Design a protein around this nucleic acid. Structure first.
Ligand SMILES: Nc1nc2c(ncn2[C@H]2C[C@H](O)[C@@H](COP(=O)(O)OP(=O)(O)OP(=O)(O)O)O2)c(=O)[nH]1
Ligand SMILES: [Ca+2]
Ligand SMILES: [Mg+2]
Length: 430
DNA sequence: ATTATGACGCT
DNA sequence: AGCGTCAT
C-alpha cells in the first residue's frame, strides 16, 4: 500500500547510437550513406567478420558475427567498410574518438555513465526538476516529442507507423496531470523532452543518429531504448511494466541473457519476466543467491536501484588479438613480436590518455589463450606498469607468461598461443 | 576461424 | 589476485 516503494524516484535515460561503426564510416564516406552497408574486421578469411550493420542491410538478414562472403550471399549489393589495421591488428581508434565526440555532447545535459563505446546512461532527475520549475505548470506539447513512442499506447479505441506513434503520444499527454510536480509520469515526460534535445544536439553536432530509452532505472531505460530503433526514443512508464513484462522473454532483460537467465527459466519453469512476480523474495534468493534474488524480485516489478555512475571514461585500456587455427603462435620470436605490436598500440593509447585525461595506469594485465582451451582466457597475470614504454611492457608481459611454455626447447612455443591480450588498469590522477 | 574490447561478480 | 559471466 502506502509504504510499498515503487521505484519511481529517478528519471534515467539510455542513449545508444544506431549501428555506430557504420555511421562513423558513412559520415566519412558519403557514398555509403543510405545504403545497405556493414563494417568488417580483416578480409582474407571469408571476406572478414561483420561487426556492424546498417538498418538497410539488416532488412536482407545481414547480422553481426556473419562472414562478409555469407552476407554477400544474402545481400549482393552490400557495401563494406573495413576497420583500419595497424601493427598487424585491428585498430579501433576512429570509433573511440567518435565516441568521445558524442559523450562530450551528452555531458552538457547531465552526468553520464559510459556503458560502452556507443552507449551512455543519463541521470535526468535534477534536470527534470529544473525544467519543471521553468514550465510553471505549463502542459507539454506533442511538438516537443517528435520522435517519442509511449510503450503500451495507443490502447482501446491508424494505418501507418507515424500515425500510431502520434495516437499513443496523444493518449499519454491527455492522461497527464501537469499540476503535480512530483508526478512520476510527468517527470518521465519532461525527461523525454530533454532527451529529444540531447539527441538533436548529437545529430546536429556530429551527424550521428541514436535511439534512447527513458524510464525510472537503467534496466528499463535500456529495454525501452530497444523497442523502437532506429532514430527514435521510447518512454517506459512504471504503469506499462505489467503488460510489457507479461510476454517478455526473460533473456531480453540486461544480465539475464546467459546462464543465469537460462537457470531462472529451467528451475522455475517459466518463460516471461512477469511470471517472476509469483515467487517470494526468499524463494528467489534460495534459487539464485541473495543478491540476484533480491534483484529479480524487484526487477520483475519494474524496480531497480543501480546508480548511474559518474564515469565518462573507460576504466581500462586494452589491446587484444586472436591467432586462430593455423596462425597460432608457435615460436618464441613470434610471441615476442606480437607482444611488442600490442604493447606499441597500448603505449600510443596510454600516452594520449595521459595527456587528455590527467591520469596514469599502474597495473598491466597480460592474458593468453592456449590451443585447445575452450575458455576465452587460459591465463591472466598482472605486473606493475611503471613506465609507458612498449619494449618494457612487452618484456614484462613475456616474463609473466614465459612459464606457460611447455616446450622443452627454448625456441619453440607449445602449445601454440591463440590469443594475446594486454590491458592497462588501476588508474591514478597525475 | 567470431574478433576486439569493456564492465563487474565471485572467492 | 585470478577466474568467470555478460555484453556485442
Ligand atoms: N570489435 C568489435 N566491435 C563490436 C562488436 N560488437 C559490437 N561492436 C561495435 C560495433 C558496433 O557498431 C558498436 C556498438 O554496438 P551495438 O550493440 O550498440 O550495435 P550497433 O550500434 O552497431 O547497432 P544498434 O543500432 O545499436 O542495434 O560496437 C564485436 O564483437 N567486436
Ligand atoms: Ca548502438
Ligand atoms: Mg550499444
Amino acid at each position: 500500500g502506502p509504504h510499498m516503494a515503487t521505484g519511481q524516484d529517478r528519471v534515467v535515460a539510455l542513449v545508444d547510437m544506431d549501428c555506430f561503426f557504420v555511421q562513423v564510416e558513412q559520415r566519412q564516406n558519403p557514398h555509403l550513406r543510405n545504403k545497405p552497408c556493414a563494417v568488417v574486421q580483416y578480409k582474407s578469411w571469408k571476406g572478414g567478420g561483420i561487426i556492424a550493420v546498417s538498418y538497410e542491410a539488416r532488412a536482407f538478414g545481414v547480422t553481426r558475427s556473419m562472414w562478409a562472403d555469407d552476407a554477400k550471399k544474402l545481400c549482393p549489393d552490400l557495401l563494406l567498410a573495413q576497420v583500419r589495421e595497424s601493427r598487424g591488428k585491428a585498430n579501433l581508434t576512429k570509433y573511440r574518438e567518435a565516441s568521445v565526440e558524442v559523450m562530450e555532447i551528452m555531458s552538457r545535459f547531465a552526468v553520464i555513465e559510459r556503458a560502452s563505446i556507443d552507449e551512455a546512461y543519463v541521470d535526468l532527475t535534477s534536470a527534470v526538476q529544473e525544467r519543471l520549475q521553468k514550465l510553471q505548470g505549463q502542459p507539454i506539447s506533442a511538438d516537443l516529442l517528435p520522435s517519442t513512442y509511449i510503450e503500451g499506447l495507443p490502447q482501446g479505441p491508424t494505418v501507418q507507423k507515424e500515425g500510431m506513434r502520434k495516437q499513443g503520444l496523444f493518449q499519454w499527454l491527455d492522461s497527464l496531470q501537469i499540476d503535480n510536480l512530483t508526478s512520476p509520469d510527468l517527470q518521465l515526460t519532461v525527461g523525454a523532452v530533454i532527451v529529444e534535445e540531447m539527441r538533436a544536439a548529437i545529430e546536429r553536432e556530429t551527424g550521428f543518429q541514436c535511439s534512447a530509452g527513458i524510464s525510472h532505472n537503467k534496466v528499463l531505460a535500456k529495454l525501452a531504448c530497444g523497442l523502437n530503433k532506429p532514430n527514435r526514443q521510447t518512454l517506459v512508464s512504471h504503469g506499462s511494466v505489467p503488460q510489457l513484462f507479461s510476454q517478455m522473454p526473460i533473456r531480453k532483460i540486461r544480465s539475464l541473457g546467459g546462464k543465469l537467465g537460462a537457470s531462472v527459466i529451467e528451475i522455475l519453469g517459466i518463460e516471461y519476466m512477469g511470471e517472476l512476480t509469483q515467487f517470494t523474495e526468499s524463494q528467489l534468493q534460495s534459487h539464485f543467491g541473495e543478491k540476484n534474488g533480491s534483484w529479480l524480485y524487484a526487477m520483475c516489478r519494474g524496480i531497480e536501484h543501480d546508480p548511474v555512475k559518474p564515469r565518462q571514461l573507460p576504466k581500462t585500456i586494452g589491446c587484444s588479438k586472436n591467432f586462430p587455427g593455423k596462425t597460432a603462435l608457435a615460436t618464441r620470436e613470434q610471441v615476442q613480436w606480437w607482444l611488442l605490436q600490442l604493447a606499441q598500440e597500448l603505449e600510443e593509447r596510454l600516452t594520449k590518455d595521459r595527456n587528455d585525461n590527467d591520469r596514469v595506469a599502474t597495473q598491466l594485465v597480460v592474458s593468453i589463450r592456449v590451443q585447445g582451451d575452450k575458455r576465452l582466457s587460459s591465463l591472466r597475470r598482472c605486473c606493475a606498469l611503471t613506465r609507458y614504454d612498449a619494449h618494457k611492457m612487452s618484456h614484462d608481459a613475456f616474463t609473466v607468461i614465459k612459464n606457460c611454455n611447455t616446450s622443452g626447447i627454448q625456441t619453440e612455443w607449445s602449445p601454440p598461443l591463440t590469443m594475446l591480450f594486454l590491458c592497462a588498469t588501476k588508474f591514478s590522477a597525475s
